[PDB]
Amino acid sequence: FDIAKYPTLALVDSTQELRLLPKESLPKLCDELRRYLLDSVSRSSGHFASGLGTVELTVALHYVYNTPFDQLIWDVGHQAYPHKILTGRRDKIGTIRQKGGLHPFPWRGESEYDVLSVGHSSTSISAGIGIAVAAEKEGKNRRTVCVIGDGAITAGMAFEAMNHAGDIRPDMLVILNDNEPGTLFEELGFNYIGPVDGHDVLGLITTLKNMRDLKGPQFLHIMTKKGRGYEPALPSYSKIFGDWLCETAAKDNKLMAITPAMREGSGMVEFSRKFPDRYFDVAIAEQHAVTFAAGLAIGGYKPIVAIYSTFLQRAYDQVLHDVAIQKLPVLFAIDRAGIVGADGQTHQGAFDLSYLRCIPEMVIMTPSDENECRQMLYTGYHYNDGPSAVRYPRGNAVGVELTPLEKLPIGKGIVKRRGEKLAILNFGTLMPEAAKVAESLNATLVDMRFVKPLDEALILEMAASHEALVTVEENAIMGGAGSGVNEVLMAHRKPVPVLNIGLPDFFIPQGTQEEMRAELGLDAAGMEAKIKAWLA
Amino acid sequence: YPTLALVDSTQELRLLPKESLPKLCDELRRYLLGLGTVELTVALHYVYNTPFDQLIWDVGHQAYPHKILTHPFPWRGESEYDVLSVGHSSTSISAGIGIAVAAEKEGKNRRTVCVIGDGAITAGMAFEAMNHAGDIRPDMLVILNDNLFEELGFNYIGPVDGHDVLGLITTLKNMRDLKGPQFLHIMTKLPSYSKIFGDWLCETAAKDNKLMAITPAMREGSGMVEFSRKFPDRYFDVAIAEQHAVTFAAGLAIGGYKPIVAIYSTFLQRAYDQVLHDVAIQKLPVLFAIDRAGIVGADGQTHQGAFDLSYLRCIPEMVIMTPSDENECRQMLYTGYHYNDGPSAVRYPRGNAVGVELTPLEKLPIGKGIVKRRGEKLAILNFGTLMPEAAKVAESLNATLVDMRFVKPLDEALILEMAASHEALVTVEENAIMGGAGSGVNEVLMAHRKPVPVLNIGLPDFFIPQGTQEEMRAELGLDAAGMEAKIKAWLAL
């Protein structure tokens, strides 16, 4: 790279080299690393911003700790760009977030300097304790350290971890990256130090050096500048939801909406401002969000849990045990359903149509466009026999016309086109492509609307009038909606070939949503090819 | 029981004179003859206007006295005095602040009180609940039945004697008009699969230094008592924290050890995200010993390990094994333990094993089922411990019988071979039919466009009620006679 523009950064290709530089040279390095971050990564990545706040902390860590031998763990990892830059990926940083480029967050297979693959938050301390325990048994003096944000240390996990750490007392350092006190951490069993200036590299080095050597659970609380923030993980469906939320809240006082620290992402900013008394941000606590909704439901209100498909994974037990078993009519507005894009593997809303389907009493809806979305939220909100869910992708609507809200009959699909030989059953926002395939193959097209309960009569009807069925969904094929269709046919002993089109059995790689959907054969062309190969 | 006899409703309890209450506790305590919440239960129903005021018990395992003055745990559909249906722990505070906020907006002065044990306050969801309450500050009382909070946002009171009936009454009454979140701290006083698991653990821990066994507060339940005593340095009880349990295992694997997470199928539901994000995505070889898989019996809907094979199955890189007997179980534990390319799981039911011969440990080829009987027209694919019954059906209908062994990856060749060899297939599993093992079988046949009819036998789409395992299995048709009857009717379609 521009060796003359960054004379000091140039002297670092590995942390080993970095540890060779003299202390007084570090402040200058930090300046070059900060400028380099702003000059090489596409601003379209947003996370470069979160990285800015850890520049000094990262240099201090790799200078004091013996990495990659010592184990460094970043929570979430959206703040690890400088970490990647200082660990042999300086000249590859410009490709981060892109298809075939560096991972959006630390990834174990990408580098020996990445100890834990992260994306969801609050996992650092737990894995960290496991790592420190192994290091202690190893007996080679391997050191452990975790960097966790003020927001991430909000999850129950973090508490379970810290409480456990407080008991077995492993030699490890937990660094609180506070960019928004210590009594709690001391009560939990940690030796607390801070708050400290997180942008004083030399000050952090001498502090880190001392604590790296101390025994037992150590906790350093630092403060970093938050900056202007970053973008969260035809109107978007998030805005559709938000708008519906506001208008519904104005109609009746029973609406209560909850988010686990994703107000903006789920499109609830305007809502939270106009109805502060109907809004709840439980912090990064998906588990409490759901059971809190149960309580509200029990108390006679109508709770709505706004949660991403990927994060809803952490509240599975509350959904099933605290809401489903009790038939509590909680409405789940699941955003980021399907492939989410740049965030990659750790954030795909690839499994909700499966893990939710095996749950008794659960009603699962999948809108094909923004009007259907509104109608289903409406239906879900007025469905009081149990829990209901409406899932939608990250992205813009199709631009359809919006009709007056009307409850949709539960478990009923609707044929959109009458064809021959082939009947394509669509579940979700992949409809536009499915529509192209049907028109191109003169096949029958059905918008299933409900994943559960399934419109069995309609399935049986399509099977009886066609040679083969094709199911389309943006979710894992295994256990998903198509799988549900197969189950119905098998039960009635009407074995009609069914091609289940959906997500393959591997975690979906990062890239553009369009770019990744095409690569997986989830577009008109790709789908027709699959059908061709299958029939062949 | 002269004092208790005068109590058939909590309204009658409130009519009695204070001085009489202590005698009631002694009687109530002898009637039962858990008994450690007698004094508190009375105090609460005596001071609070229940069932108008909402009383929430965490876990419910110790709600017997509560039920007398009023299912194994409090169930909303049973009584109106059971505000929240429980089973799993740490839900009280969570649903409770939800109920407190509702009561706040209702404006009818309805009170909210949650009773939680010291074990339940170790769960991550209790931490999230208290934090949130300390923020929005709803009017409510959390009672810690002990047999930091001020830092979370609560006004702490105590400690106080939990066995002093009149004492608790006075205190509860004194806190009547205290606003915001209040916290009252009181002080109170034939082999089974679980067995083969524990023995296997001890045996294995004696062969290497890598094994590490973790449990989220269920030592005896998972039959690990012996192991904890013989290999204290390989045992880890992380309290009621399923999430941390799994991610802690991930860390042990990253460090070079071979972690084994011993957890109930129901509770594993609470660590779903850690299993998927912290183990599967990193392809870390953690082994999961899933106990109480299938119908557990007396514990009811809140403890049924019924979705086990459905939620793990959609996860990429996951290896799922379903022992048909105790010998298979040890082979699979051994296999899963030495499978280093990713996470593996071995699920087994609560209760006694079949009584088969135990053969020396040997690795099983991943994703390979085995044909046990070759019949005609029908091929029965078994997944799990319902095999004895499935075998009876096989002999009765002269059907081919196969022990699939793996739920994932499935033995596709065997499935395609069987489908080509018969007119129909029948899958048997003690898991929800929807998204289960058999469902996976359907998927293979369809992907190959070889649609032979398949009869998926498993648990129905409703939470199954409490009752002995045999009773529930016979009632659901997971009986030999029930299965055969199901097959006949299915073929009669």
Ligand SMILES: Cc1ncc(C[n+]2csc(CCOP(=O)(O)OP(=O)(O)O)c2C)c(N)n1
């Ligand atoms: C379990 C989980 N829930 C939600 C998210 C979405 N998320 C990603 S970043 C973030 C906030 C993290 O806050 P903090 O650790 O203080 O870092 P900061 O946002 O200040 O950069 C959230 C909610 C997540 N990654 N994981």
Ligand SMILES: [K+]
């Ligand atoms: K509802």
Ligand SMILES: [K+]
């Ligand atoms: K293993």
Ligand SMILES: [Mg+2]
């Ligand atoms: Mg922060």
Ligand SMILES: [Mg+2]
């Ligand atoms: Mg207790």
